[PDB]
From a paper:
Phylogenetically diverse bacteria can carry out chloramphenicol reduction, but only a single enzyme has been described that efficiently catalyzes this reaction, the NfsB nitroreductase from Haemophilus influenzae strain KW20. We found that expression of H. influenzae and Neisseria spp. nfsB genes, but not Pasteurella multocida nfsB, allows Escherichia coli to resist chloramphenicol by nitroreduction. Mass spectrometric analysis confirmed that purified H. influenzae and N. meningitides NfsB enzymes reduce chloramphenicol to amino-chloramphenicol, while kinetics analyses supported the hypothesis that chloramphenicol reduction is a secondary activity. Previous kinetic studies of nitroreductase catalysis revealed that reactions progress by a double-displacement (ping-pong) mechanism that appears to lack the gating steps necessary to impose specificity, explaining the substrate promiscuity of these enzymes.
To understand better how variation in the substrate-binding site mediates activity, we solved the crystal structures of the NfsB homologs from Hi KW20, Hi Int1, Hi 86-028NP, and Nm Z2491. The Hi Int1 and Hi 86-028NP enzymes showed comparable, although statistically significant, kinetics (q < 0.05) to Hi KW20 NfsB. The relative increase in resistance conferred by H. influenzae or Neisseria nfsB expression ranged from approximately a 16-fold increase (Hi KW20 and Hi 86-028NP) down to an ∼2-fold increase (Hi Int1 and Hi 12). The divergence in chloramphenicol resistance and in vitro activity likely reflect the vagaries of heterologous expression in Es. coli and suggest the presence of important subtleties that still need to be accounted for when estimating mobilization risks of cryptic and proto-resistance genes. This is especially evident with the NfsB enzymes from Hi KW20 and Hi Int1. A molecular explanation for this difference remains to be determined. Intuitively, the Ser68-Met74 pair found in Hi 12 NfsB would provide more of the flexibility needed to properly locate and orient Trp71 to make space for the ribose of NADP than the Pro68-Ile74 pair in other H. influenzae NfsB homologs (Pro68-Ala74 in Nm Z2491 NfsB).
Author numbering:
A (entry chain A), B (entry chain B): 1 to 220
């Protein structure tokens, strides 16, 4: 098993910073980048839903086409080693074909599936109130994809690989772009969040966070 | 700098599983659990919004009060060492006082603030269409808190401490419950997600995930 001291764990999450300036001469090995993607694939997700898809956008022409509506990463698109656009599943209702696969991956038998479907329905409809509209239910999947996002960042960091998480683009324009390019079915998926990966070309900014006393309330 | 091999990074995310059964005779040390909290505090977040608050629910009475509407952690409420209920910030509009503190942590002068506010309005109103209603704006904050959740699960795993993310509870009753105890302002925050921590009483269940070829689309 992988074990670290508190000092090592602190440094790992302290050393990961948002890299906005990448060295264009350095690329991540195929072995290293596969490892990053694995951090995403292995991430936990609510009821094992795994509602993500990781588009890896290495095509230079597609990257260029995104610049005019991707201000959050416009200078990173040229220089980063790798770009992942994470999609989230649309309409992941408890009764959709999508949850049939969720349960098959669990090896549920028919009676367990009936209980699981009741669980999912309760969670979605009553506990979490996700079935109000398409957007709330999509955002539930999206939340899960940010878990994958976070583990990919941390995993990149552990490998000595710099990253930047990315929201700064027009989402309608991004969805239209990528869907028009044939990269996903827009009725089935939509863009959730993005992230660049590479090796920094400039200095990383000092961490700036709220204090621990500001963000924690102990209820003893 | 903390550095891991590819194999160690994989094992970090294979060894972490959702712990349903905690040994009640085993407690996380105060130092270890502060380290876990630091993983969440140091997490990245969109425009550095850090829109989380971490409620550490150690009180036994209060844990017991939560049991009847928290089916997703019924046995865990009793046996786990530590419980965190993560809140996300409500109504985190670009022009809110919440964002006055966001810019202040970034040391922005007056000119930098008017540019940042213009960037925040663009992101919320046009790019991400977060201002449709209160819930879409909340769910944006909630997505950031799932990064902090992920990093606390991962940091715990590197310390050798087991965890389980928790959505399985009635959100309306839990909001009502924690607010009634006077633990947060329901008009400023709402419950996002929860997580248990401690030491597992059973061996790790093998991962079941979609394959890498199923979740990755390479666009060369
Ligand atoms: C956001 C979220 C909420 C979850 N809620 C619960 C819960 O309430 N009860 C539970 O036992 N597991 C919960 N889990 C754990 C998942 O069921 C689990 O991650 C999935 O089945 C994969 O198993 P693994 O994490 O052990 O690989 C949740 C996971 C996530 C990411
Ligand atoms: C979901 C999300 C989206 C982000 N989008 C952007 C982006 O579009 N452009 C950018 O340069 N930074 C982006 N960031 C990075 C944050 O601005 C950054 O994490 C924070 O301001 C500074 O902290 P750090 O360097 O400690 O990560 C984003 C971060 C997250 C979590």
């Amino acid at each position: 098993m992988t074990q670290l001291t508190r000092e090592q764990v602190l440094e790992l999450f302290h050393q990961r910073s948002s890299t906005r300036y990448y060295d264009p001469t350095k690329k991540i090995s195929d072995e290293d980048f596969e490892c990053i993607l694995e951090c995403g694939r292995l991430s936990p997700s609510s009821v094992g839903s795994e509602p993500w898809k990781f588009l890896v956008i290495q095509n230079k022409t597609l990257r260029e086409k995104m610049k005019p509506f991707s201000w959050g990463m416009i200078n990173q698109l040229d220089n980063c080693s790798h770009l992942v656009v994470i999609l989230a599943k649309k309409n992941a209702r408890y009764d959709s074909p999508f949850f049939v696969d969720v349960m098959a991956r669990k090896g549920l038998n028919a009676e367990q599936q009936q209980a699981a479907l009741a669980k999912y329905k309760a969670l979605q409809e009553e506990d979490m109130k996700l079935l109000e509209n398409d957007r709330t239910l999509f955002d539930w999947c999206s939340k899960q994809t940010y878990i994958a996002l976070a583990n990919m960042l941390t995993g990149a960091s552990a490998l000595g690989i710099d990253s930047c998480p990315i929201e700064g683009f027009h989402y309608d324009k991004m969805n239209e772009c990528l869907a028009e390019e044939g990269l996903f079915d827009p009725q089935e998926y939509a863009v959730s969040v993005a992230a660049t990966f590479g090796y920094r070309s400039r200095d990383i900014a000092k961490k700036s966070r709220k204090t621990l006393d500001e963000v924690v309330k102990w209820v003893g």
